[PDB]
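Colleagues,

For the teaching module next term, I've prepared a clean inverse folding example: a structure given as tokens, and then the sequence designed for it. I'd like students to try predicting residues themselves before seeing the answer, so please don't circulate the second half yet.
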């Protein structure tokens, strides 16, 4: 394997003797050269673990590094300042000051120019992190809501131009808000240039995807593949008009990229640098678990998948240090945490906490949630969870069956209940969600619906508002970067028209992807409305979180409340949080509270609470007690 010094001299060979002398003395080269020495070793090691002695590795690597240099040379000075700042502030992601929001540009504000005008509201809410859903070109009609990318560089004409996007990002930065977008690196649309040329037999794009002559290998692979989008096709392959078969984990128009081909990595690393230089702060690594395939396995979470992501990480450490990764690994808890690391994905979605929040509302029992917060919350230094209540996606019931079995709970049976309860097929349920990808062959099913619809706000359940505040309170205070699904802060309901829409009827997730509700937003400052009660309740928690250092960091220690309906945890040994998941008053006994201070101030209600006597929490009440 070549070393950093050797490779750097060859990067400079593009310049004439005279030009070269100027580059070697430039500040940009000084930074790049230093970062190469520090991080290239990791990059080389990761790529070697995946490609081994592949003859194309070295040639690909030199091409990639040459690109990295040019990319960094062109990188705007302001971004380079952010580069140095985060290089010396790895834990910026762990600060209690951070609060994020996510939205679709078209649904929430029409287009990019309209989005820029919403910035004042984002500052009003207190956001310091804004994630925008897929905004680049995609097939007309069905494109999986933008996740079937036809181009990683050309903005969806309906949203605006690449110029509008660069203006939006600069505007977000001026407002003190970080920009976050998707890095849909596991697959492209079948209309993407690479896909077309690969299928047409263009040698330049040979092996850019996984295409087979017949069903021989696809059948073999399907023996162990899990069906992700069973409604669209069985197994993981789709057939082309010419009879051949292509690997398609998701929709048939989404073709899985072939990372076993080093040139595919190079290509995607090139797109990553492009996004980096737009000023993007964080890239959401979409469907990270599927980037490597191997016959006989589920082709999810394989070792090479982690190595590839760590390789991508090194490229940013070298040519755009400011860019961090947000892992979107919706898999078994043991696998989720493996993508999170300073050298892999600095932050990652916390599907376990999310799924268990909803689980707890349904069962009224915190057993599973307590278990998760106790044994699966703390993360390695310089990393953090992205805690959420809802997203643009369906809700998958993430949790370890082995953990549940320890609590006397059967995973399969329990999920049957959870799905029934949340799609309102269980007597007494307050939830009004809808099924997503029900698989009759496995009994598996996921749930669609907005947060408000799942807590019963659609039928005006008197507990709806408090349930919303309870769930978000946990994502906002457990430790990690909280991500609010914009629209939730005013109780936005499902869009019931989706099922009638020809391009959406086959995907129930559109039920929870409603447009900006002007009526609800106009009520956000009215305490007599659900929208105002929700907004002010959440805004208050956001205010407290960002100003009170007791919430800083991502570590917590659970507190045994001795009441199966109340969750409890402590932040920095100074903030004791209690959350009642019962629709009835629940008590934490004075006996249980003996080690706590005589009295403590509750940041939610603002009153002084006595902990030397039984503490009774009203239905769904949340308390944030300052015990130090
Ligand atoms: O651009 C496309 C798309 O991308 C984004 O969103 C994507 C995600 O990126 C992608 O990951 C995916 O997430 C899906 C997921 O793939 C689905 O499978 C599902 O996952 C849920 C599931 O519905 C729940 O049931 C629950 O799974 C449990 C499971 O119930 C439980 O039993 C256990 O299962 C493990 C089992 O215990 C093990 O023994 C073993 O099982 C083996 C056997 O051992 C073996 O003998 C044989 O039988 O095979 C078995 C299976 O291999 O492994 C089992 C698997 O771990 O544990 C699991 C996990 O706790 O929870 C999971 C969630 O983790 O739904 C999610 C989505 O909710 O798809 C999304 C899109 O939906 C992008 O955001 C999106 O917009 C784009 O469209
Ligand atoms: O207002 C409009 C509204 O009208 C309708 O709703 C009505 C109902 O029709 C009416 O009956 C009533 O419902 C009340 C009820 O009267 C109250 O008592 C209360 O219900 C309690 C319930 O009595 C308690 O037992 C408790 O149940 C929990 C349970 O404690 C918890 O463990 C869990 O249980 C599930 C378990 O977690 C799952 O694993 C599974 O268990 C499986 C195993 O997995 C399997 O291995 C094997 O063992 O089989 C097991 C089967 O038992 O399933 C378990 C559930 O069966 O969850 C349950 C349910 O939460 O707590 C509840 C709640 O405190 O509240 C209800 C609701 O208020 O009044 C309402 C309202 O007027 C209409 O139906 C509704 O849609 C409309 O919105
Ligand atoms: O290495 C960590 C360190 O933690 C020490 O204590 C922490 C403990 O692990 C954690 O559970 C919690 O402790 C509180 C209990 O959860 C809570 O129930 C309550 O305990 C009462 C019992 O429930 C009653 O049965 C009776 O015993 O009275 C108890 C009150 O004295 O309060 C506990 C104190 O907050 O937090 C602790 C620190 O935040 C371990 O003790 C130590 O061995 C570990 O090394």
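(Answer key — instructors only)
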């Amino acid at each position: 394997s070549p070393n950093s010094q050797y490779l750097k001299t060859r990067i400079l060979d593009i310049y004439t003797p005279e030009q070269r002398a100027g580059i070697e003395k430039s500040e940009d080269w000084r930074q790049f050269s230093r970062r190469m020495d520090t991080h290239f070793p990791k990059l080389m090691n990761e790529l070697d673990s995946v490609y081994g002695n592949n003859e194309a590795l070295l040639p690909m690597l030199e091409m990639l590094l040459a690109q990295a240099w040019q990319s960094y040379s062109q990188r705007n000075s302001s971004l380079k300042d952010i580069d140095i700042a985060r290089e010396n502030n790895p834990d910026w992601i762990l600060s209690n000051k951070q609060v994020g929001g996510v939205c679709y540009v078209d649904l929430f504000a029409g287009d990019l120019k309209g989005l820029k005008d919403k910035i004042p509201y984002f500052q009003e809410l207190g956001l310091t992190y804004l994630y925008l859903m897929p905004l680049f070109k995609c097939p007309e009609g069905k494109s999986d809501g933008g996740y079937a990318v036809s181009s990683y560089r050309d903005v969806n004409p309906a949203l605006g131009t690449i110029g509008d996007l660069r203006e939006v990002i600069a505007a977000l930065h001026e407002a003190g808000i970080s920009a976050v977008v998707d890095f849909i690196f596991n697959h492209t649309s079948n209309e993407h240039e690479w896909a077309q040329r690969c299928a047409a037999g263009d040698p330049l794009f040979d092996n850019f995807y996984y295409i087979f002559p017949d069903r021989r290998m696809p059948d073999q692979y399907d023996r162990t593949l899990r069906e992700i989008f069973p409604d669209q096709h069985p197994g993981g392959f789709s057939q082309l008009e010419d009879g051949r078969w292509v690997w398609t984990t998701f929709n048939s128009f989404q073709w899985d990229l072939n990372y076993s081909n080093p040139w595919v990595f190079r290509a995607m690393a090139g797109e990553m640098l492009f996004l980096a230089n737009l000023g993007v702060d964080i890239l959401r690594m979409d469907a990270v678990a599927f980037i490597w395939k191997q016959m006989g396995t589920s082709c999810e979470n394989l070792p090479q998948a982690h190595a590839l992501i760590r390789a991508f990480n090194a490229v940013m450490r070298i040519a755009a240090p400011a860019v961090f990764f947000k892992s979107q690994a919706i898999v078994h808890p043991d696998q989720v945490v493996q993508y999170i690391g300073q050298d892999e994905c600095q932050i990652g979605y916390n599907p376990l906490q999310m799924a268990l929040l909803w689980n707890t509302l349904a069962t009224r029992e915190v057993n599973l949630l307590h278990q998760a917060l106790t044994y699966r919350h703390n993360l390695p230094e310089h990393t953090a969870w992205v805690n959420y209540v809802r997203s643009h996606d369906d809700i998958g019931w993430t949790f370890a069956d082995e953990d549940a079995a320890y609590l006397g709970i059967s995973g399969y049976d329990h999920r049957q209940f959870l799905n029934r309860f949340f799609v309102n097929r269980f007597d007494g349920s307050f939830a009004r969600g809808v099924p997503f990808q029900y698989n009759p062959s496995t009994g598996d099913c996921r749930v669609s619906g907005t947060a408000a619809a799942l807590v019963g706000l659609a039928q005006d359940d008197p507990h709806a508002v408090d349930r919303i505040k309870l769930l978000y309170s946990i994502a906002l205070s457990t430790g990690g970067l909280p991500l609010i699904y914009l629209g939730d802060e005013v109780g936005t309901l499902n869009d019931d028209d989706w099922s009638q829409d020809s391009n959406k009827s086959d995907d129930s997730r559109w039920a929870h992807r409603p447009r900006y509700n002007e009526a609800l937003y106009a009520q956000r400052n009215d305490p007599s409305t659900a929208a105002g009660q929700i907004y002010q309740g959440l805004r208050h928690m956001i205010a407290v979180r960002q100003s009170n250092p007791r919430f800083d960091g991502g570590r917590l220690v659970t507190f045994n409340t001795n009441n199966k309906h109340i969750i409890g945890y402590i932040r920095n040994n100074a903030l004791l949080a209690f959350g009642n998941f019962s629709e009835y008053p629940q008590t934490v006994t004075a006996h249980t509270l003996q080690a706590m201070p005589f009295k403590a101030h509750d940041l939610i209600g603002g009153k002084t609470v006595s902990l030397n006597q039984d503490l009774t929490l009203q239905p769904y009440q949340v308390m944030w007690l300052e015990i130090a």
